[PDB]
Design a protein around this ligand. Structure first.
Ligand code: HEM
Length: 453
């Protein structure tokens, strides 16, 4: 079989189709037309975009395909280095960091981070409690303050103190601008044109800002010998079960940067989409709110209680089904192979899993894939294998998954315990794309239930 391909533009091939504010949504639109697989060419590059569970279940077979570093990840590596997210599976620092960080991100480790997550969650709730009657909430903006601060504290015991400022801490400003430059480079056919010399200067100084802050904290932590409940203490003390070495200081810095860039935006996007679907579906908001009130009975949520928020958990998964906030991941064929009995691949060929399309596969989910129905997830034993992949695949799946879900469940639970929410502008969904996806301009009003905190 021969595969479909969207509009080409001569020597730029398909590249101009993604010269847009919303390239992932462009790709979904193209998928809707072309089906489960289409070819997409840029100068010197070819990728095949997959949208059906039928084909993605094969792509997720690790004996046949491994994680690929996409152009985006290669660009992000200029500041994320050989951290877990931007490494090849067979790079020695991937294997070593994977072994060392595994118990730091396990469900048990969540008991240790819970107090610091609650610290920032309480800040977010207190902020909302202190709003005057005239005021509203900028939802993604606050969710991002919350996730950055949480990752800062659990990551390296550092307070960005985002709820104390109008202009973010300079580290955050530089990180956001480095990510932006990395995504922007995706569209640059002529990377080295003098027109970009200034982008380069700014990129290098942003990398410098990030490295100086993190390197300094690591160096001071080593000098002082101080110990804390953060990931930095784990990495300073952890010996690889295979090689018996700890991560060196430079890689520790990259893992810290990596937790921030891989975790802050995806998780805040998730909280934002979930709140959106809840105010667009009042029945569901009421069910979630009832559970939160029922379960979070203490002035401050315990680890055990968050684990009891089953329906909030379903709400989060159903938001991830519709708008998985890291919406695409890349794979390469380890050897020549034939995909789906129909599409021959050569060794090294690139595949891109388009998660939002997979999550809309009618042959899996049914007639009602656009509806927000948390009940799909009542019985996780019911979901076909490889049908639901918001956290990627296999040994290269999100290492942050337990952290992200525990933070999102705690926070969404506390929000629904403490406030009634009004969609006062009858907000029209508008999805901004950076490296990740989020609602843009999503605003609400929160009326306090006046429950002690
Ligand atoms: C809802 C929130 C999140 C989503 C949807 C998400 C999604 C993903 C996805 C799809 C991947 C696979 C990337 C690929 O195949 O190229 C990934 C990898 C990764 N994520 Fe997450 N992420 C989330 C939150 C977090 C958080 C909070 C952290 C850290 C605290 C984190 C850390 C990582 C790391 C370290 C990797 C690379 C793991 C490895 O390859 O060994 N993520 N994430």
């Amino acid at each position: 079989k021969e595969m479909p391909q969207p509009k080409t533009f001569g020597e730029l091939k398909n590249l101009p189709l993604l010269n847009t504010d919303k390239p992932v949504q462009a790709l979904m639109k193209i998928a809707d037309e072309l089906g489960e697989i289409f070819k997409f060419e840029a100068p010197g590059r070819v990728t095949r975009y997959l949208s059906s569970q039928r084909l993605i279940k094969e792509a997720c077979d690790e004996s046949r395909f491994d994680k690929n570093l996409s152009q985006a990840l290669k660009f992000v590596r200029d500041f994320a280095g050989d951290g877990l997210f931007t490494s090849w599976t067979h790079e020695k620092n991937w294997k070593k960091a994977h072994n060392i960080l595994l118990p730091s991100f396990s469900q048990q480790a969540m008991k240790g981070y819970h107090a610091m997550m609650v610290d920032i969650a309480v800040q977010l709730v207190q902020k909302w409690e202190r709003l005057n009657a005239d005021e509203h909430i900028e939802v993604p903006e606050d969710m991002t303050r919350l996730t950055l601060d949480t990752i800062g504290l659990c990551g390296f015991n550092y307070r960005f103190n985002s709820f104390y400022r109008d202009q973010p801490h300079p580290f955050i400003t530089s990180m956001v601008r480095a990510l932006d430059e990395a995504m922007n480079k995706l569209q640059r056919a002529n990377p080295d044109d003098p027109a970009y010399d200034e982008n380069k200067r700014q990129f290098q100084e942003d990398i410098k800002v990030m490295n100086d802050l993190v390197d300094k904290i690591i160096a001071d932590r080593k000098a002082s010998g101080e110990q804390s409940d953060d990931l930095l203490t784990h990495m300073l003390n952890g010996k690889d079960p295979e090689t018996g070495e700890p991560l060196d200081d430079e890689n520790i810095r990259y893992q810290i940067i990596t937790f921030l860039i891989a975790g802050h935006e995806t998780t805040s996007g998730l909280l934002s989409f979930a709140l959106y679907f809840l105010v667009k579906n009042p029945h569901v908001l009421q069910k979630a709110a009832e559970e939160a009130a029922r379960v979070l009975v203490d002035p401050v949520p315990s680890y055990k209680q968050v684990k009891q928020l089953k329906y909030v958990g379903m709400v989060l998964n159903e938001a991830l089904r519709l708008w998985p906030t890291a919406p695409a991941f890349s794979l390469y064929a380890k050897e020549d192979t034939v995909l789906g009995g129909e599409y021959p691949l050569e060794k090294g060929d690139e595949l891109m899993v388009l998660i939002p399309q997979l999550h809309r596969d009618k042959t899996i989910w049914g007639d009602d894939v656009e509806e927000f129905r948390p009940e799909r997830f009542e019985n996780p034993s019911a979901i076909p294998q490889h049908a639901f992949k918001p956290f990627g695949n296999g040994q290269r799946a999100c290492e942050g998954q337990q952290f992200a879900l525990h933070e999102a469940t705690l926070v969404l639970g506390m929000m629904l315990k403490h406030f009634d929410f009004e969609d006062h502008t009858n907000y029209e969904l508008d999805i901004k794309e950076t490296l990740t996806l989020k609602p843009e301009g999503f605003v609400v009003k929160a009326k306090s239930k006046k429950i002690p905190l």
